[PDB]
Design an enzyme around this catalytic site. Structure first.
Site, PDB file in Angstrom:
ATOM      1  N   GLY B 143     -13.854  75.292  39.512  1.00  0.00           N
ATOM      2  CA  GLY B 143     -14.140  73.886  39.688  1.00  0.00           C
ATOM      3  C   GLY B 143     -14.062  73.094  38.395  1.00  0.00           C
ATOM      4  O   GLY B 143     -14.207  73.632  37.300  1.00  0.00           O
ATOM      5  N   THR B 145     -16.178  70.550  37.509  1.00  0.00           N
ATOM      6  CA  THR B 145     -17.521  70.426  36.957  1.00  0.00           C
ATOM      7  C   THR B 145     -18.087  71.788  36.572  1.00  0.00           C
ATOM      8  O   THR B 145     -18.699  71.935  35.507  1.00  0.00           O
ATOM      9  CB  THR B 145     -18.439  69.726  37.961  1.00  0.00           C
ATOM     10  OG1 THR B 145     -17.858  68.475  38.345  1.00  0.00           O
ATOM     11  CG2 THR B 145     -19.806  69.468  37.345  1.00  0.00           C
ATOM     12  N   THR B 179     -10.321  76.181  46.439  1.00  0.00           N
ATOM     13  CA  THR B 179     -10.104  74.761  46.678  1.00  0.00           C
ATOM     14  C   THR B 179      -8.957  74.175  45.872  1.00  0.00           C
ATOM     15  O   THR B 179      -8.359  73.189  46.306  1.00  0.00           O
ATOM     16  CB  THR B 179     -11.377  73.963  46.364  1.00  0.00           C
ATOM     17  OG1 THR B 179     -11.690  74.092  44.971  1.00  0.00           O
ATOM     18  CG2 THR B 179     -12.547  74.474  47.192  1.00  0.00           C
ATOM     19  N   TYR B 224     -19.133  79.135  53.660  1.00  0.00           N
ATOM     20  CA  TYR B 224     -19.933  79.062  52.442  1.00  0.00           C
ATOM     21  C   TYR B 224     -21.395  79.392  52.712  1.00  0.00           C
ATOM     22  O   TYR B 224     -22.094  79.886  51.820  1.00  0.00           O
ATOM     23  CB  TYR B 224     -19.811  77.674  51.810  1.00  0.00           C
ATOM     24  CG  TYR B 224     -18.507  77.434  51.083  1.00  0.00           C
ATOM     25  CD1 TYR B 224     -17.777  78.491  50.554  1.00  0.00           C
ATOM     26  CD2 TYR B 224     -18.009  76.148  50.921  1.00  0.00           C
ATOM     27  CE1 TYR B 224     -16.586  78.272  49.886  1.00  0.00           C
ATOM     28  CE2 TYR B 224     -16.820  75.920  50.256  1.00  0.00           C
ATOM     29  CZ  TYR B 224     -16.113  76.985  49.741  1.00  0.00           C
ATOM     30  OH  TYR B 224     -14.929  76.759  49.079  1.00  0.00           O
ATOM     31  N   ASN B 228     -23.158  82.379  50.564  1.00  0.00           N
ATOM     32  CA  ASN B 228     -24.265  82.007  49.688  1.00  0.00           C
ATOM     33  C   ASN B 228     -25.553  82.736  50.051  1.00  0.00           C
ATOM     34  O   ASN B 228     -26.363  83.030  49.165  1.00  0.00           O
ATOM     35  CB  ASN B 228     -24.481  80.494  49.732  1.00  0.00           C
ATOM     36  CG  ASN B 228     -23.345  79.726  49.086  1.00  0.00           C
ATOM     37  OD1 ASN B 228     -22.362  80.312  48.637  1.00  0.00           O
ATOM     38  ND2 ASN B 228     -23.474  78.404  49.041  1.00  0.00           N
ATOM     39  N   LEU B 252     -35.741  87.882  29.415  1.00  0.00           N
ATOM     40  CA  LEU B 252     -34.305  87.686  29.243  1.00  0.00           C
ATOM     41  C   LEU B 252     -33.764  88.445  28.037  1.00  0.00           C
ATOM     42  O   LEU B 252     -32.590  88.830  28.027  1.00  0.00           O
ATOM     43  CB  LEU B 252     -33.994  86.195  29.119  1.00  0.00           C
ATOM     44  CG  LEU B 252     -34.250  85.380  30.387  1.00  0.00           C
ATOM     45  CD1 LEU B 252     -34.114  83.897  30.111  1.00  0.00           C
ATOM     46  CD2 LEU B 252     -33.295  85.808  31.490  1.00  0.00           C
ATOM     47  N   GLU B 254     -34.591  91.448  27.176  1.00  0.00           N
ATOM     48  CA  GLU B 254     -34.348  92.819  27.606  1.00  0.00           C
ATOM     49  C   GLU B 254     -33.072  92.953  28.429  1.00  0.00           C
ATOM     50  O   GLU B 254     -32.517  94.054  28.513  1.00  0.00           O
ATOM     51  CB  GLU B 254     -35.548  93.335  28.404  1.00  0.00           C
ATOM     52  CG  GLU B 254     -35.548  94.835  28.641  1.00  0.00           C
ATOM     53  CD  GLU B 254     -36.764  95.309  29.413  1.00  0.00           C
ATOM     54  OE1 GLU B 254     -37.827  94.661  29.309  1.00  0.00           O
ATOM     55  OE2 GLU B 254     -36.655  96.325  30.129  1.00  0.00           O
TER      56      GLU B 254
HETATM   57  N1  LIG Z   1     -19.699  81.327  47.013  1.00  0.00           N
HETATM   58  C1  LIG Z   1     -19.547  80.006  47.023  1.00  0.00           C
HETATM   59  N2  LIG Z   1     -18.509  79.430  46.319  1.00  0.00           N
HETATM   60  C2  LIG Z   1     -18.345  78.085  46.324  1.00  0.00           C
HETATM   61  C3  LIG Z   1     -19.217  77.272  47.031  1.00  0.00           C
HETATM   62  N3  LIG Z   1     -18.822  75.992  46.860  1.00  0.00           N
HETATM   63  C4  LIG Z   1     -17.728  75.976  46.062  1.00  0.00           C
HETATM   64  N4  LIG Z   1     -17.416  77.267  45.731  1.00  0.00           N
HETATM   65  C5  LIG Z   1     -16.309  77.714  44.869  1.00  0.00           C
HETATM   66  O1  LIG Z   1     -16.093  76.759  43.852  1.00  0.00           O
HETATM   67  C6  LIG Z   1     -14.716  76.626  43.570  1.00  0.00           C
HETATM   68  C7  LIG Z   1     -14.385  75.153  43.377  1.00  0.00           C
HETATM   69  O2  LIG Z   1     -15.326  74.568  42.506  1.00  0.00           O
HETATM   70  P1  LIG Z   1     -16.503  73.610  43.043  1.00  0.00           P
HETATM   71  O3  LIG Z   1     -17.841  74.153  42.601  1.00  0.00           O
HETATM   72  O4  LIG Z   1     -16.448  73.499  44.548  1.00  0.00           O
HETATM   73  O5  LIG Z   1     -16.194  72.179  42.360  1.00  0.00           O
HETATM   74  P2  LIG Z   1     -17.207  71.450  41.337  1.00  0.00           P
HETATM   75  O6  LIG Z   1     -17.957  72.466  40.511  1.00  0.00           O
HETATM   76  O7  LIG Z   1     -18.166  70.544  42.071  1.00  0.00           O
HETATM   77  O8  LIG Z   1     -16.264  70.599  40.342  1.00  0.00           O
HETATM   78  P3  LIG Z   1     -15.295  69.427  40.878  1.00  0.00           P
HETATM   79  O9  LIG Z   1     -13.867  69.914  40.879  1.00  0.00           O
HETATM   80  O10 LIG Z   1     -15.409  68.233  39.962  1.00  0.00           O
HETATM   81  O11 LIG Z   1     -15.694  69.042  42.282  1.00  0.00           O
HETATM   82  C8  LIG Z   1     -13.957  77.224  44.742  1.00  0.00           C
HETATM   83  O12 LIG Z   1     -13.123  78.261  44.282  1.00  0.00           O
HETATM   84  C9  LIG Z   1     -15.012  77.805  45.659  1.00  0.00           C
HETATM   85  O13 LIG Z   1     -14.706  79.142  45.980  1.00  0.00           O
HETATM   86  C10 LIG Z   1     -20.265  77.845  47.740  1.00  0.00           C
HETATM   87  O14 LIG Z   1     -21.045  77.135  48.372  1.00  0.00           O
HETATM   88  N5  LIG Z   1     -20.425  79.215  47.734  1.00  0.00           N
HETATM   89  C1  LIG Z   2      -1.062  74.140  46.283  1.00  0.00           C
HETATM   90  O1  LIG Z   2      -2.486  74.110  46.260  1.00  0.00           O
HETATM   91  C2  LIG Z   2      -3.102  73.117  46.970  1.00  0.00           C
HETATM   92  C3  LIG Z   2      -2.454  72.169  47.741  1.00  0.00           C
HETATM   93  C4  LIG Z   2      -3.191  71.201  48.399  1.00  0.00           C
HETATM   94  C5  LIG Z   2      -4.575  71.167  48.282  1.00  0.00           C
HETATM   95  N1  LIG Z   2      -5.329  70.128  48.909  1.00  0.00           N
HETATM   96  N2  LIG Z   2      -4.641  69.363  49.619  1.00  0.00           N
HETATM   97  C6  LIG Z   2      -5.283  68.139  49.967  1.00  0.00           C
HETATM   98  C7  LIG Z   2      -4.658  67.307  50.890  1.00  0.00           C
HETATM   99  C8  LIG Z   2      -5.273  66.141  51.299  1.00  0.00           C
HETATM  100  O2  LIG Z   2      -4.741  65.263  52.200  1.00  0.00           O
HETATM  101  C9  LIG Z   2      -3.451  65.564  52.722  1.00  0.00           C
HETATM  102  C10 LIG Z   2      -6.520  65.790  50.784  1.00  0.00           C
HETATM  103  O3  LIG Z   2      -7.132  64.625  51.188  1.00  0.00           O
HETATM  104  C11 LIG Z   2      -6.809  63.487  50.394  1.00  0.00           C
HETATM  105  C12 LIG Z   2      -7.142  66.622  49.854  1.00  0.00           C
HETATM  106  O4  LIG Z   2      -8.346  66.181  49.381  1.00  0.00           O
HETATM  107  C13 LIG Z   2      -8.991  66.974  48.390  1.00  0.00           C
HETATM  108  C14 LIG Z   2      -6.531  67.794  49.454  1.00  0.00           C
HETATM  109  C15 LIG Z   2      -5.228  72.119  47.505  1.00  0.00           C
HETATM  110  C16 LIG Z   2      -4.498  73.100  46.854  1.00  0.00           C
HETATM  111  O5  LIG Z   2      -5.138  74.039  46.110  1.00  0.00           O
END
Ligand SMILES: Nc1nc2c(ncn2[C@@H]2O[C@H](COP(=O)(O)OP(=O)(O)OP(=O)(O)O)[C@@H](O)[C@H]2O)c(=O)[nH]1
Ligand SMILES: COc1ccc(/N=N/c2cc(OC)c(OC)c(OC)c2)cc1O
Ligand SMILES: Nc1nc2c(ncn2[C@@H]2O[C@H](COP(=O)(O)OP(=O)(O)O)[C@@H](O)[C@H]2O)c(=O)[nH]1
Ligand SMILES: [Ca+2]
Ligand SMILES: [Mg+2]
Lengths: 426, 437, 155
Positions: B143, B145, B179, B224, B228, B252, B254
């Site tokens: 992610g 963040t 994602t 998820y 989780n 911590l 240890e």
């Molecule tokens: N196990 C588990 N993984 C999660 C969950 N939510 C997101 N992830 C993982 O987090 C990754 C994406 O990062 P996110 O934490 O969703 O995004 P973010 O930290 O909010 O950062 P942004 O991109 O700014 O939204 C993905 O590969 C997911 O597999 C969750 O609820 N459980």
């Molecule tokens: C090749 O890898 C990826 C390709 C597409 C991915 N997501 N695709 C979208 C498509 C959307 O609308 C069509 C979204 O709505 C605007 C959208 O909002 C987040 C994401 C994600 C991938 O990791």
């Protein structure tokens, strides 16, 4: 990332933009008066992405209507969803462009662009959390192509960190036999390469071949072509209008679909192709990657997929969708780039479009889109080699070098698609 | 009693943090409003659970947790959920525009607009502690963040809290629930920038938890919520020694003395057993030896790797429930020989054992069955380099063509940091190989 | 100079002005700086009346400019079907080749004037004619994926 300011410019932009507001309002449950006559509260989640909230449960679309021709103003008002627009958002001029890209971009449109920009701020500054803009227009005309690309650059100068999205309609001699349209399209692609983050390539050539050969329509009308455009714009904006899992973000879509900044021209696809007034999970995925379902006259089996995004809509088991998509990637592994791992994203939505119980939308960044650009470039070179009608453009103050630079830019754009189409990871 | 502060960053950190604190309250006997009936001392305490829970004058037990995210969608569900009355309101920090799965946005542009506010709220919890020992940071790898903002936070915590410990629970990316396509980029970038500032990091492979839910929990398509709940069950088994009485991993400091032989190699492997579906409420009760054997099966590990391919440098066993100490010694004596287990020459071949005689707590609505004995093995093996090798390969495939790189360079980041991060990863794999893998 | 006035008159489509100038001895076969005759401009801008008038008064139906473009080349490019047939009715060379190797059949196929493509083949258009890059009218249809164009060329 929530509000999106829609802008439609030109005769084609206002026409296909009106169908967009008619289709998505049916899906979200909004009457032409503006009330919400829906039967599910899921239609109000992220409703403010494409609508404002006025008193009386009245939702007003966030659309701005632009065209130099004054006749287009009455063309939208007299529509079914005609009076669900702000009278202050109608920006129209005295005379038109007459298929002249120079008139819309340098002379006539330059006097009206500031009239539109001041309307954009009123919508933008009144947004809670604006994310970007979407534009519907054609490239073969003078208003939507000439003034449209000018309006894009002026908006980006005041909103640099926002996402610019466009639904561009590519010209074709099968639908409009005008020899100056390759001039306008090539000059506009030179602008769309630099000032847009993502562009959907809607090809009238592909739309004609679908109505004529697939839908068995002998004399396809613009309403026949726009039925596919409205059905495609609804699917590509499915996440942008409903919860699901992808939380609707134009930026996150661009980060995952645009690996290289110039290669931001998308090939849309839709299934099943239906006419007007008239499938299993392995069926939708099959047609989704078929050349007959793409809205761009390009064979995807002539190139390679850089990134792919697919949106399924309707009642379907989530596990079966993950099986077929992985299965199609196996049977067609040679058509995906091996240096972008996991380049196929699958989206799902419970709410399907009206008249359908299941559907699928394809958003592909394929190198095979060069075939479309090679076509418009070939028509451009033949016309420009003989200097035909070039005085219509230089008389408005345009330099002849701009034509040579626009053709040189698109030829370089085609060369970049070929470089990555032959690259290997080793 | 030495207080620990938990920090949750991004959707992954916040949602896993939400399920973790729900399980803590069921294990300690805390109600959603924060009332602990079996707490004699009101307004204060010296007990072991006070390392995670503070006490107000009205008998309210509040977590020592901070929730941070650059967008409010995920945290808003914690603000209106079941335990909305439990957390401090000012410890739920939300922005308006997230990092868009871009490391550069979380670390340079967007993250800097909220970094000072996050540290001032963390400072407020630190001032309430009589003996702060460190931090626990929950974030994702892929992610924007979780990778960009966390590394910036870890850099700032090392300056303000120089001698304090910092542990991570990181979410390793998996294509089944990924994602973003650039998650290999964000994972490598945040590792290079957090490696020096982290004392110990427990990686959670999303694919490992995914397969366990499919295979052992009979879940056709894990969401998820299912992942989780199993993750929080293992996080609780790891932090239980910090929250209860015991003698193994009591603080911590240890944790790294027992698991971290050298600073750069601070990625222990967690293994949990048994995982039994809740639909089999009348299952046969596994013995101490049968759950101890399961700790050396790759299908029970939190990170998909083959431990018999590498060497062990540390092995700690944490049992929970009806467990007799002589039964553990007998189970070790067989496994010490009957299984292909290899320790490095420079490590004393030993197995540290800590027993908690309370069986695990199951949350209402979970997918796990009640067990009378469970075990969580924490081991530092060189086989975990396979996770880095799989992550560096996807990095090399994309960075060779410079794909998606312009998105990072456009947010204040320089391209030289990409090559600098990959070189740091090549040295890390070289660190594991020069030990034995 | 009436030759320069007949050029501008044939472009703008002033039929009465064309008749006046030719009565005063205007060079019907005059050329501009690029070699374009009044018949070139009248065929380009689609003035069928001026086209038939010039051909009745000694206009060379097969004149070329500096780039080797005949009036039939420009008429097939812009898409003036009636002017194409009038030129062919007065002995226009259907297989004339310009400096780029293009014939009237190449330009009609590239611009998608299917009606003109059918007329050129009826008058004996060479389908084996190659441009400077070796492309024939058939190659253009295959490379462009134009099924309607390929069907017409497969009579
Ligand atoms: N196990 C588990 N993984 C999660 C969950 N939510 C997101 N992830 C993982 O987090 C990754 C994406 O990062 P996110 O934490 O969703 O995004 P973010 O930290 O909010 O950062 P942004 O991109 O700014 O939204 C993905 O590969 C997911 O597999 C969750 O609820 N459980
Ligand atoms: C090749 O890898 C990826 C390709 C597409 C991915 N997501 N695709 C979208 C498509 C959307 O609308 C069509 C979204 O709505 C605007 C959208 O909002 C987040 C994401 C994600 C991938 O990791
Ligand atoms: N698909 C589709 N294409 C259109 C429509 N209207 C016009 N076009 C195309 O757009 C081109 C004309 O551009 P136009 O928008 O009318 O000119 P403008 O007023 O300057 O923007 C022609 O090539 C048409 O094929 C429509 O409703 N649907
Ligand atoms: Ca107490
Ligand atoms: Mg997020």
């Amino acid at each position: 990332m929530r509000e999106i300011v829609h802008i439609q410019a030109g005769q084609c932009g206002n026409q296909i933009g009106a169908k967009f507001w008619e289709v998505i309002s049916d899906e979200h449950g909004i009457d032409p008066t503006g009330s919400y006559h829906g039967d599910s509260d899921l239609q109000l989640e992220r409703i403010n992405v494409y609508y404002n909230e006025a008193t009386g449960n009245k939702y007003v679309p966030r659309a701005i209507l632009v065209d130099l021709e004054p006749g287009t103003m009455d063309s939208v008002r007299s529509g079914p969803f005609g009076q669900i627009f702000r009278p202050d958002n109608f920006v129209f001029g005295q005379s038109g462009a007459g298929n002249n890209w120079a008139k819309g971009h340098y002379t006539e449109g330059a006097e009206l662009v500031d009239s539109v920009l001041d309307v954009v701020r009123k919508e933008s500054e009144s947004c809670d959390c604006l994310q970007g803009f979407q534009l519907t227009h054609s490239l073969g005309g003078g208003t939507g192509s000439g003034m449209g690309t000018l309006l894009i650059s002026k908006i980006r100068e005041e909103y640099p960190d926002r996402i610019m999205n466009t639904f561009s309609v590519m010209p074709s001699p099968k639908v409009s036999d005008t020899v100056v349209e390759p001039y306008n399209a090539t000059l506009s692609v030179h602008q769309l390469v630099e000032n847009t983050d993502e562009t959907y390539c809607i090809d009238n050539e592909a739309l004609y071949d679908i109505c004529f050969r697939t839908l068995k329509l002998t004399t396809p009308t613009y309403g026949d072509l726009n039925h596919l455009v409205s059905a495609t714009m609804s699917g590509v904006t499915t996440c942008l209008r409903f919860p699901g899992q992808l939380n609707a973000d134009l930026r996150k879509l661009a980060v995952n679909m645009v690996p290289f900044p110039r290669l931001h021209f998308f090939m849309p696809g839709f299934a099943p192709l239906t006419s007007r007034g008239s499938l299993t999970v392995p069926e939708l995925t099959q047609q989704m990657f078929d050349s007959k379902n793409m809205m761009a006259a390009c064979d995807p089996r002539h190139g390679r997929y850089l990134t792919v995004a697919a949106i399924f809509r309707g009642r379907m088991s989530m596990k079966e969708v993950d099986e077929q998509m992985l299965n199609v990637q196996n049977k067609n592994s040679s058509y995906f780039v091996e240096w972008i791992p996991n380049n196929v994203k699958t989206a799902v939505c419970d709410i399907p479009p009206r008249g359908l119980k299941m559907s699928a939308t394809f958003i592909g960044n394929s190198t095979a889109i060069q075939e479309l650009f090679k076509r418009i470039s070939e028509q451009f070179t033949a016309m420009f080699r003989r200097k035909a009608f070039l005085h219509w453009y230089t008389g408005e103050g345009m330099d002849e070098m701009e034509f040579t630079e626009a053709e040189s830019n698109m030829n370089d754009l085609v060369s970049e698609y070929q470089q990555y189409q032959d690259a290997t990871a080793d | 009693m030495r207080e620990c502060i938990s920090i949750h960053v991004g959707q992954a950190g916040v949602q896993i943090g939400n399920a973790c604190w729900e399980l803590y309250c069921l294990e300690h006997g805390i109600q959603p409003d924060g009332q602990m009936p079996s707490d004699k001392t009101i307004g204060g305490g010296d007990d072991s659970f006070n390392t995670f829970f503070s006490e107000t004058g009205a008998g309210k037990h509040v977590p020592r947790a901070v929730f941070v995210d650059l967008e409010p969608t995920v945290i808003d569900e914690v603000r209106t959920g079941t335990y909305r009355q439990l957390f401090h309101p000012e410890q739920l920090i939300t922005g308006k525009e997230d990092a868009a799965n871009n490391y550069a946005r979380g670390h340079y542009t967007i993250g800097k607009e909220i970094i000072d506010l996050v540290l001032d709220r963390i400072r407020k919890l630190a001032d309430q502690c009589t003996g702060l020992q460190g931090f626990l940071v929950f974030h994702s790898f892929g992610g924007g963040t979780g990778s960009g903002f966390t590394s910036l936070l870890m850099e700032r915590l090392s300056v303000d809290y120089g001698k304090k410990s910092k542990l991570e629970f990181s979410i390793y990316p998996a294509p089944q629930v990924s994602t973003a396509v650039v998650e290999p980029y964000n994972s490598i970038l945040t590792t290079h920038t957090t490696l020096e500032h982290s004392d110990c990091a427990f990686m959670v492979d999303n694919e490992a938890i995914y397969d366990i839910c499919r295979r052992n929990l009979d879940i056709e398509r894990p969401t998820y919520t299912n992942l989780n709940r199993l993750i929080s069950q293992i996080v609780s088994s790891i932090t239980a020694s910090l929250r209860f009485d015991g003698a193994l991993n009591v603080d911590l400091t240890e944790f790294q003395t027992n698991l971290v032989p050298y600073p750069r190699i601070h990625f222990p492997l967690a293994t949990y057993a048994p995982v039994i579906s809740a639909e089999k409420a009348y299952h046969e009760q596994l013995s101490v030896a049968e759950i101890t054997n399961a700790c050396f099966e790759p299908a029970n590990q939190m990170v998909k790797c083959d431990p018999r391919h590498g060497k062990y440098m540390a092995c700690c066993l944490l049992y929970r429930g009806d467990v007799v100490p002589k039964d553990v010694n007998a189970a070790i004596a067989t496994i010490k020989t009957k299984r292909s287990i290899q320790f490095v020459d420079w490590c004393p071949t030993g197995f540290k054992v800590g027993i908690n005689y309370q069986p695990p707590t199951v949350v209402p609505g979970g997918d796990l069955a009640k067990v009378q004995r469970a075990v969580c093995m924490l081991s530092n093996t060189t086989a975990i380099a396979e996770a880095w090798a799989r992550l560096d390969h996807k990095f090399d495939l994309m960075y060779a063509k410079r794909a998606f790189v312009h998105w990072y360079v456009g947010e204040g980041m320089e391209e030289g940091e990409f090559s600098e991060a990959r070189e740091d990863m090549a040295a890390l794999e070289k660190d594991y190989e020069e030990v034995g893998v | 100079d009436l030759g320069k006035k007949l050029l501008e008159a044939a472009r703008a489509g002033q039929d009465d002005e064309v008749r006046i100038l030719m009565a005063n001895g205007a060079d019907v076969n005059a050329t501009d700086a690029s070699g374009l005759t009044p018949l070139h401009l009248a065929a380009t801008y689609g003035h069928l009346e001026i086209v038939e008038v010039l051909l009745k008064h000694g206009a060379d139906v097969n004149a070329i400019d500096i780039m080797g473009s005949t009036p039939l080349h420009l008429a097939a490019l812009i898409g003036h079907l009636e002017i194409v047939e009038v030129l062919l009715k007065h002995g226009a060379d259907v297989n004339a080749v310009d400096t780029w190797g293009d014939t009237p059949l190449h330009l009609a196929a590239i611009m998608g004037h299917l009606e003109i493509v059918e007329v050129l083949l009826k008058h004996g258009a060479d389908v084996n004619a190659q441009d400077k890059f070796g492309k024939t009218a058939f190659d253009i249809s295959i490379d462009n994926g134009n099924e309607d164009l390929a069907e017409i060329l497969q009579k």
